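Dear support,

We are seeing what looks like truncated structure output for some complexes. This example has two components. We would appreciate it if you could run it in full and send us the complete C-alpha coordinate output so we can diff it against ours.
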Amino acid sequence: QVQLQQSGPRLVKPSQTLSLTCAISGDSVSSSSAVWTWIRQSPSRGLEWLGRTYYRSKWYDDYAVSVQGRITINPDTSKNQISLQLNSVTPDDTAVYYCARSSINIFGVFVMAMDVWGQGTAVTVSSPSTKGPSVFPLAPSSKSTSGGTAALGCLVKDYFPEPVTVSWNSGALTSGVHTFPAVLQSSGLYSLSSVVTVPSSSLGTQTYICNVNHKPSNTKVDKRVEP
Amino acid sequence: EIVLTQSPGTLSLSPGERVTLSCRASQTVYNSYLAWYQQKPGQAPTLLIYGTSTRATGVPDRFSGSGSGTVFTLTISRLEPEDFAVYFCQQYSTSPRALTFGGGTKVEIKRTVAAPSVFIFPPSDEQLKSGTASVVCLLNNFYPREAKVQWKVDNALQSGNSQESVTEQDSKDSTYSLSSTLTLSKADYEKHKVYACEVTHQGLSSPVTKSFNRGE
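Here is the complete output from our reference environment:
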Protein backbone atom coordinates (compact mmCIF):
# COMPACT_ATOMS: atom_id res chain seq x y z
CA GLN A 1 0.00 0.00 0.00
CA VAL A 2 1.01 3.60 0.73
CA GLN A 3 3.54 4.20 3.50
CA LEU A 4 5.33 7.39 4.53
CA GLN A 5 8.68 6.86 6.28
CA GLN A 6 10.05 9.89 8.14
CA SER A 7 13.40 10.84 9.64
CA GLY A 8 14.24 9.62 13.09
CA PRO A 9 14.15 12.05 16.01
CA ARG A 10 16.15 15.25 15.71
CA LEU A 11 17.88 17.58 18.14
CA VAL A 12 18.35 21.09 16.70
CA LYS A 13 20.14 23.98 18.37
CA PRO A 14 18.22 27.26 18.73
CA SER A 15 18.68 29.60 15.75
CA GLN A 16 19.75 26.68 13.48
CA THR A 17 17.89 24.74 10.77
CA LEU A 18 15.57 21.74 11.10
CA SER A 19 15.78 19.35 8.12
CA LEU A 20 13.39 16.38 7.78
CA THR A 21 12.58 13.87 5.06
CA CYS A 22 9.46 11.87 4.23
CA ALA A 23 10.09 8.89 1.92
CA ILE A 24 7.01 7.76 -0.03
CA SER A 25 6.23 4.20 -1.07
CA GLY A 26 3.15 3.08 -2.98
CA ASP A 27 2.58 6.42 -4.69
CA SER A 28 4.51 8.84 -6.86
CA VAL A 29 5.53 12.14 -5.27
CA SER A 30 4.74 13.81 -8.61
CA SER A 31 1.24 12.28 -8.83
CA SER A 32 -1.33 14.76 -10.11
CA SER A 33 -3.81 12.99 -7.81
CA ALA A 34 -1.90 13.71 -4.58
CA VAL A 35 -0.98 16.58 -2.29
CA TRP A 36 1.84 16.22 0.24
CA THR A 37 1.74 18.14 3.50
CA TRP A 38 3.69 18.75 6.71
CA ILE A 39 1.82 19.15 9.99
CA ARG A 40 3.23 19.44 13.49
CA GLN A 41 1.82 18.75 16.94
CA SER A 42 2.85 20.17 20.29
CA PRO A 43 1.21 19.81 23.72
CA SER A 44 0.98 23.59 24.11
CA ARG A 45 -0.31 24.55 20.65
CA GLY A 46 -1.85 21.36 19.24
CA LEU A 47 -2.01 20.46 15.56
CA GLU A 48 -0.64 23.06 13.14
CA TRP A 49 -0.49 22.89 9.36
CA LEU A 50 2.88 24.01 7.97
CA GLY A 51 2.60 23.70 4.19
CA ARG A 52 2.06 21.51 1.17
CA THR A 53 3.68 20.68 -2.15
CA TYR A 54 2.17 19.10 -5.25
CA TYR A 55 2.90 18.65 -8.95
CA ARG A 56 0.52 19.80 -11.69
CA SER A 57 2.69 20.07 -14.82
CA LYS A 58 4.98 22.05 -12.48
CA TRP A 59 5.76 22.09 -8.77
CA TYR A 60 3.77 24.25 -6.36
CA ASP A 61 4.28 25.08 -2.68
CA ASP A 62 1.82 26.67 -0.25
CA TYR A 63 2.98 27.60 3.26
CA ALA A 64 1.09 28.54 6.41
CA VAL A 65 1.21 32.22 7.36
CA SER A 66 2.81 31.36 10.70
CA VAL A 67 6.00 29.98 9.08
CA GLN A 68 6.12 31.77 5.70
CA GLY A 69 9.61 33.11 5.15
CA ARG A 70 11.53 30.40 7.00
CA ILE A 71 10.04 27.18 5.56
CA THR A 72 10.81 25.19 2.41
CA ILE A 73 9.11 21.97 1.29
CA ASN A 74 11.04 20.40 -1.58
CA PRO A 75 10.24 17.24 -3.54
CA ASP A 76 12.89 14.84 -4.78
CA THR A 77 11.56 12.67 -7.59
CA SER A 78 14.68 10.48 -7.77
CA LYS A 79 14.25 9.51 -4.10
CA ASN A 80 10.42 9.79 -4.26
CA GLN A 81 10.35 11.91 -1.12
CA ILE A 82 9.50 15.33 0.22
CA SER A 83 11.60 17.33 2.64
CA LEU A 84 10.97 20.00 5.24
CA GLN A 85 13.46 22.77 6.02
CA LEU A 86 12.59 25.12 8.87
CA ASN A 87 15.10 27.94 9.50
CA SER A 88 15.92 29.94 12.63
CA VAL A 89 14.25 27.52 15.03
CA THR A 90 13.26 28.44 18.58
CA PRO A 91 11.97 26.25 21.43
CA ASP A 92 8.47 26.95 20.09
CA ASP A 93 9.39 24.67 17.18
CA THR A 94 9.80 21.68 19.50
CA ALA A 95 7.06 19.34 18.27
CA VAL A 96 6.24 16.04 16.62
CA TYR A 97 6.34 16.68 12.85
CA TYR A 98 4.16 14.59 10.52
CA CYS A 99 4.10 14.28 6.78
CA ALA A 100 0.82 13.25 5.21
CA ARG A 101 -0.90 12.70 1.90
CA SER A 102 -4.22 14.11 0.80
CA SER A 103 -5.82 12.66 -2.33
CA ILE A 104 -9.55 13.11 -1.73
CA ASN A 105 -11.04 15.29 -4.47
CA ILE A 106 -14.61 16.56 -4.12
CA PHE A 107 -16.12 18.30 -7.16
CA GLY A 108 -12.65 18.96 -8.52
CA VAL A 109 -11.11 20.40 -5.33
CA PHE A 110 -8.55 18.68 -3.13
CA VAL A 111 -10.35 19.22 0.18
CA MET A 112 -7.16 18.52 2.20
CA ALA A 113 -8.47 15.70 4.38
CA MET A 114 -5.33 13.71 5.16
CA ASP A 115 -5.70 10.03 4.28
CA VAL A 116 -2.16 8.66 4.89
CA TRP A 117 0.23 9.76 7.62
CA GLY A 118 3.89 9.24 8.39
CA GLN A 119 4.89 7.93 11.79
CA GLY A 120 5.97 11.35 13.15
CA THR A 121 9.40 12.81 13.92
CA ALA A 122 10.05 14.05 17.46
CA VAL A 123 12.04 17.30 17.18
CA THR A 124 13.65 19.00 20.18
CA VAL A 125 15.02 22.53 19.87
CA SER A 126 17.60 22.86 22.66
CA SER A 127 21.29 23.60 23.22
CA PRO A 128 22.62 20.66 25.32
CA SER A 129 24.45 17.81 23.65
CA THR A 130 22.91 14.39 23.15
CA LYS A 131 23.55 11.86 25.91
CA GLY A 132 22.69 8.17 25.81
CA PRO A 133 20.94 6.40 28.69
CA SER A 134 22.16 3.99 31.29
CA VAL A 135 19.89 0.95 31.52
CA PHE A 136 19.33 -0.79 34.83
CA PRO A 137 17.23 -3.87 35.59
CA LEU A 138 14.10 -3.71 37.73
CA ALA A 139 14.17 -7.21 39.23
CA PRO A 140 11.23 -8.42 41.35
CA SER A 141 11.99 -9.96 44.72
CA SER A 142 11.49 -13.66 45.35
CA LYS A 143 8.46 -13.11 47.59
CA SER A 144 6.68 -10.72 45.20
CA THR A 145 6.62 -13.54 42.63
CA SER A 146 5.26 -16.08 45.15
CA GLY A 147 1.90 -15.16 43.68
CA GLY A 148 1.16 -16.02 40.09
CA THR A 149 2.59 -12.79 38.70
CA ALA A 150 6.14 -11.46 38.35
CA ALA A 151 6.77 -7.80 37.60
CA LEU A 152 9.99 -7.07 35.69
CA GLY A 153 11.34 -3.94 34.10
CA CYS A 154 14.13 -1.66 32.99
CA LEU A 155 15.07 1.80 34.28
CA VAL A 156 16.29 3.99 31.39
CA LYS A 157 18.15 6.83 33.07
CA ASP A 158 20.03 10.04 32.26
CA TYR A 159 19.43 10.58 28.55
CA PHE A 160 18.80 13.60 26.33
CA PRO A 161 16.73 14.45 24.29
CA GLU A 162 13.55 12.42 24.17
CA PRO A 163 12.51 9.98 22.86
CA VAL A 164 13.66 6.46 23.64
CA THR A 165 12.07 3.28 22.37
CA VAL A 166 11.73 0.23 24.61
CA SER A 167 10.69 -3.20 23.42
CA TRP A 168 10.75 -6.55 25.21
CA ASN A 169 12.22 -9.76 23.76
CA SER A 170 12.85 -8.00 20.43
CA GLY A 171 9.14 -7.20 20.13
CA ALA A 172 7.94 -10.74 20.84
CA LEU A 173 6.54 -9.70 24.25
CA THR A 174 3.87 -6.99 24.12
CA SER A 175 1.09 -8.16 26.45
CA GLY A 176 1.28 -6.50 29.86
CA VAL A 177 4.04 -4.07 28.85
CA HIS A 178 3.78 -0.54 30.26
CA THR A 179 6.35 2.06 29.23
CA PHE A 180 5.89 5.22 31.26
CA PRO A 181 6.27 8.88 30.29
CA ALA A 182 9.77 10.14 30.98
CA VAL A 183 10.39 12.65 33.75
CA LEU A 184 12.92 15.46 33.56
CA GLN A 185 15.47 15.40 36.41
CA SER A 186 17.15 18.41 38.01
CA SER A 187 20.22 17.54 35.88
CA GLY A 188 18.27 18.29 32.71
CA LEU A 189 18.37 14.61 31.74
CA TYR A 190 15.34 12.34 31.31
CA SER A 191 14.52 9.13 33.18
CA LEU A 192 11.96 6.51 32.17
CA SER A 193 10.82 3.07 33.27
CA SER A 194 9.33 0.18 31.30
CA VAL A 195 7.72 -2.81 33.03
CA VAL A 196 5.94 -6.03 32.14
CA THR A 197 4.05 -8.58 34.22
CA VAL A 198 4.61 -12.25 33.38
CA PRO A 199 3.82 -15.63 34.94
CA SER A 200 6.16 -16.47 37.80
CA SER A 201 6.27 -20.06 36.53
CA SER A 202 8.21 -18.79 33.50
CA LEU A 203 11.06 -17.06 35.36
CA GLY A 204 13.20 -20.20 35.11
CA THR A 205 12.29 -21.27 31.58
CA GLN A 206 11.88 -17.91 29.79
CA THR A 207 14.40 -15.12 29.28
CA TYR A 208 13.27 -11.51 29.47
CA ILE A 209 15.27 -8.79 27.71
CA CYS A 210 14.40 -5.11 27.39
CA ASN A 211 15.64 -3.59 24.14
CA VAL A 212 16.38 0.13 24.56
CA ASN A 213 17.12 2.37 21.58
CA HIS A 214 18.05 6.04 21.97
CA LYS A 215 18.45 7.09 18.35
CA PRO A 216 19.82 10.64 18.88
CA SER A 217 22.93 9.21 20.59
CA ASN A 218 23.00 5.93 18.62
CA THR A 219 22.75 4.05 21.92
CA LYS A 220 21.30 0.54 21.80
CA VAL A 221 21.18 -1.61 24.94
CA ASP A 222 19.76 -5.11 25.45
CA LYS A 223 19.45 -5.77 29.20
CA ARG A 224 18.49 -9.22 30.46
CA VAL A 225 16.28 -8.94 33.55
CA GLU A 226 16.55 -11.88 35.96
CA PRO A 227 14.58 -11.95 39.26
CA GLU B 1 -8.21 32.64 9.72
CA ILE B 2 -10.94 30.26 10.87
CA VAL B 3 -10.69 29.06 14.48
CA LEU B 4 -12.27 25.72 15.40
CA THR B 5 -13.38 25.37 19.04
CA GLN B 6 -14.08 21.87 20.32
CA SER B 7 -16.26 21.06 23.31
CA PRO B 8 -16.15 19.52 25.76
CA GLY B 9 -12.36 19.34 26.26
CA THR B 10 -12.57 15.96 28.02
CA LEU B 11 -15.38 13.44 28.41
CA SER B 12 -15.58 10.32 30.59
CA LEU B 13 -18.27 7.86 29.52
CA SER B 14 -19.10 4.18 29.91
CA PRO B 15 -18.90 1.82 26.93
CA GLY B 16 -22.30 1.40 25.34
CA GLU B 17 -23.18 5.08 25.75
CA ARG B 18 -23.70 7.63 23.00
CA VAL B 19 -20.91 10.22 22.62
CA THR B 20 -21.59 13.64 21.05
CA LEU B 21 -18.61 15.86 20.21
CA SER B 22 -19.03 19.47 19.07
CA CYS B 23 -16.85 21.60 16.78
CA ARG B 24 -17.69 25.32 16.40
CA ALA B 25 -16.12 27.36 13.59
CA SER B 26 -15.47 31.09 13.88
CA GLN B 27 -16.97 31.55 10.41
CA THR B 28 -18.73 29.40 7.85
CA VAL B 29 -16.97 26.22 6.75
CA TYR B 30 -18.47 24.76 3.59
CA ASN B 31 -19.55 21.15 3.77
CA SER B 32 -16.81 19.64 1.57
CA TYR B 33 -14.07 21.03 3.81
CA LEU B 34 -14.82 19.82 7.38
CA ALA B 35 -13.08 16.62 8.53
CA TRP B 36 -12.67 14.62 11.75
CA TYR B 37 -9.74 12.51 12.97
CA GLN B 38 -9.16 10.02 15.77
CA GLN B 39 -5.76 10.01 17.49
CA LYS B 40 -4.75 7.22 19.84
CA PRO B 41 -1.71 7.67 22.11
CA GLY B 42 1.63 7.44 20.33
CA GLN B 43 0.03 7.32 16.87
CA ALA B 44 -0.61 9.75 14.07
CA PRO B 45 -4.24 10.85 13.67
CA THR B 46 -6.37 8.77 11.34
CA LEU B 47 -9.14 10.15 9.17
CA LEU B 48 -12.62 9.34 10.50
CA ILE B 49 -15.03 11.58 8.57
CA TYR B 50 -14.54 13.92 5.64
CA GLY B 51 -16.80 16.29 3.78
CA THR B 52 -18.70 16.81 7.08
CA SER B 53 -20.61 13.54 6.91
CA THR B 54 -18.81 10.94 4.74
CA ARG B 55 -17.35 8.02 6.68
CA ALA B 56 -13.78 7.33 5.66
CA THR B 57 -13.01 3.93 4.18
CA GLY B 58 -13.06 1.14 6.79
CA VAL B 59 -14.45 3.27 9.65
CA PRO B 60 -17.01 1.48 11.88
CA ASP B 61 -20.62 2.48 11.40
CA ARG B 62 -20.79 3.71 14.99
CA PHE B 63 -18.99 6.92 13.86
CA SER B 64 -21.01 9.60 12.07
CA GLY B 65 -20.55 13.28 11.29
CA SER B 66 -23.20 15.95 10.83
CA GLY B 67 -23.84 19.68 10.98
CA SER B 68 -23.31 22.67 8.73
CA GLY B 69 -22.39 26.35 8.75
CA THR B 70 -20.47 26.94 11.99
CA VAL B 71 -21.52 23.97 14.18
CA PHE B 72 -20.42 20.42 13.39
CA THR B 73 -20.93 17.21 15.39
CA LEU B 74 -19.21 13.83 15.60
CA THR B 75 -21.33 11.08 17.16
CA ILE B 76 -20.22 7.69 18.46
CA SER B 77 -23.46 5.73 18.64
CA ARG B 78 -22.22 3.18 21.20
CA LEU B 79 -18.82 3.73 22.78
CA GLU B 80 -16.29 0.90 22.84
CA PRO B 81 -13.16 0.67 25.03
CA GLU B 82 -10.87 0.90 22.01
CA ASP B 83 -12.37 4.31 21.20
CA PHE B 84 -10.21 5.93 23.90
CA ALA B 85 -8.57 8.71 21.89
CA VAL B 86 -8.47 12.43 21.21
CA TYR B 87 -10.86 13.47 18.43
CA PHE B 88 -10.05 16.49 16.25
CA CYS B 89 -12.00 18.47 13.72
CA GLN B 90 -10.26 20.19 10.82
CA GLN B 91 -11.21 22.77 8.18
CA TYR B 92 -9.59 23.73 4.89
CA SER B 93 -10.18 27.16 3.36
CA THR B 94 -9.35 27.74 -0.30
CA SER B 95 -9.15 31.54 -0.16
CA PRO B 96 -7.02 32.52 1.57
CA ARG B 97 -5.36 29.06 1.56
CA ALA B 98 -5.53 27.94 5.19
CA LEU B 99 -5.85 24.74 7.19
CA THR B 100 -6.66 24.62 10.90
CA PHE B 101 -7.57 22.08 13.55
CA GLY B 102 -9.70 22.18 16.65
CA GLY B 103 -8.05 21.64 20.00
CA GLY B 104 -9.40 18.12 20.41
CA THR B 105 -11.83 16.35 22.72
CA LYS B 106 -10.35 13.52 24.81
CA VAL B 107 -12.82 10.65 25.21
CA GLU B 108 -11.93 8.70 28.36
CA ILE B 109 -13.52 5.36 29.21
CA LYS B 110 -15.48 4.96 32.44
CA ARG B 111 -15.06 1.49 33.94
CA THR B 112 -15.51 -0.20 37.29
CA VAL B 113 -13.12 0.63 40.10
CA ALA B 114 -9.98 -1.52 39.91
CA ALA B 115 -7.44 -1.78 42.71
CA PRO B 116 -3.75 -1.58 41.76
CA SER B 117 -1.29 -4.37 42.14
CA VAL B 118 1.85 -2.97 43.76
CA PHE B 119 5.50 -3.95 43.31
CA ILE B 120 8.69 -2.48 44.75
CA PHE B 121 12.12 -2.68 43.08
CA PRO B 122 15.45 -2.12 44.89
CA PRO B 123 18.26 -0.28 43.11
CA SER B 124 20.39 -2.56 40.99
CA ASP B 125 23.94 -3.34 42.10
CA GLU B 126 25.06 -1.94 38.73
CA GLN B 127 23.55 1.48 39.43
CA LEU B 128 24.97 1.62 42.96
CA LYS B 129 28.50 1.39 41.56
CA SER B 130 27.71 4.77 39.95
CA GLY B 131 26.84 6.73 43.12
CA THR B 132 23.05 7.00 42.87
CA ALA B 133 20.24 4.72 44.03
CA SER B 134 16.85 4.67 42.29
CA VAL B 135 14.04 2.82 44.10
CA VAL B 136 10.96 2.16 41.98
CA CYS B 137 7.33 1.53 42.94
CA LEU B 138 4.85 0.21 40.36
CA LEU B 139 1.06 0.54 40.67
CA ASN B 140 -0.34 -1.72 37.96
CA ASN B 141 -3.71 -1.66 36.17
CA PHE B 142 -5.95 0.48 38.38
CA TYR B 143 -8.98 2.75 37.96
CA PRO B 144 -9.70 5.59 38.51
CA ARG B 145 -6.51 7.56 37.95
CA GLU B 146 -6.34 9.14 41.42
CA ALA B 147 -3.75 7.34 43.56
CA LYS B 148 -1.43 8.29 46.42
CA VAL B 149 2.13 6.99 46.72
CA GLN B 150 4.04 7.53 49.98
CA TRP B 151 7.71 6.57 50.32
CA LYS B 152 9.13 5.66 53.73
CA VAL B 153 12.78 5.01 54.58
CA ASP B 154 13.31 3.42 57.99
CA ASN B 155 9.69 4.53 58.58
CA ALA B 156 10.47 8.21 57.90
CA LEU B 157 8.07 9.71 55.36
CA GLN B 158 9.98 11.02 52.35
CA SER B 159 9.26 14.30 50.58
CA GLY B 160 10.79 16.11 47.64
CA ASN B 161 12.94 13.23 46.38
CA SER B 162 10.53 11.25 44.17
CA GLN B 163 9.00 11.66 40.72
CA GLU B 164 6.10 9.78 39.20
CA SER B 165 4.34 9.36 35.90
CA VAL B 166 1.21 7.64 34.64
CA THR B 167 0.36 5.77 31.46
CA GLU B 168 -2.57 6.68 29.27
CA GLN B 169 -5.70 4.58 29.66
CA ASP B 170 -5.22 1.04 28.33
CA SER B 171 -7.07 0.45 25.06
CA LYS B 172 -8.27 -2.98 26.24
CA ASP B 173 -8.94 -2.93 29.99
CA SER B 174 -9.20 0.86 30.36
CA THR B 175 -6.86 0.99 33.38
CA TYR B 176 -3.91 3.19 34.32
CA SER B 177 -0.50 2.28 35.65
CA LEU B 178 1.84 4.50 37.63
CA SER B 179 5.59 4.44 38.25
CA SER B 180 7.24 6.32 41.12
CA THR B 181 11.01 6.66 41.50
CA LEU B 182 12.65 7.54 44.81
CA THR B 183 16.15 8.90 44.12
CA LEU B 184 18.78 8.81 46.87
CA SER B 185 22.52 9.22 46.97
CA LYS B 186 24.36 5.93 47.39
CA ALA B 187 25.55 7.11 50.82
CA ASP B 188 21.99 7.72 52.03
CA TYR B 189 20.68 4.46 50.57
CA GLU B 190 23.45 2.61 52.44
CA LYS B 191 22.60 4.44 55.69
CA HIS B 192 19.12 2.91 55.89
CA LYS B 193 17.56 -0.55 55.80
CA VAL B 194 13.77 -0.66 55.30
CA TYR B 195 12.39 0.83 52.09
CA ALA B 196 8.62 0.98 51.67
CA CYS B 197 6.07 2.16 49.11
CA GLU B 198 2.60 2.73 50.63
CA VAL B 199 -0.30 3.01 48.19
CA THR B 200 -3.74 4.52 48.81
CA HIS B 201 -6.48 4.04 46.21
CA GLN B 202 -10.28 3.99 46.06
CA GLY B 203 -10.20 0.29 45.17
CA LEU B 204 -8.18 -0.72 48.24
CA SER B 205 -10.07 -1.37 51.47
CA SER B 206 -6.97 -0.06 53.27
CA PRO B 207 -3.54 1.07 52.06
CA VAL B 208 -1.15 -1.49 50.60
CA THR B 209 2.53 -1.35 51.57
CA LYS B 210 5.30 -3.14 49.69
CA SER B 211 8.78 -3.04 51.17
CA PHE B 212 12.22 -4.60 51.16
CA ASN B 213 15.25 -4.61 53.47
CA ARG B 214 18.49 -3.45 51.87
CA GLY B 215 20.81 -6.43 51.57
CA GLU B 216 18.04 -8.99 52.16
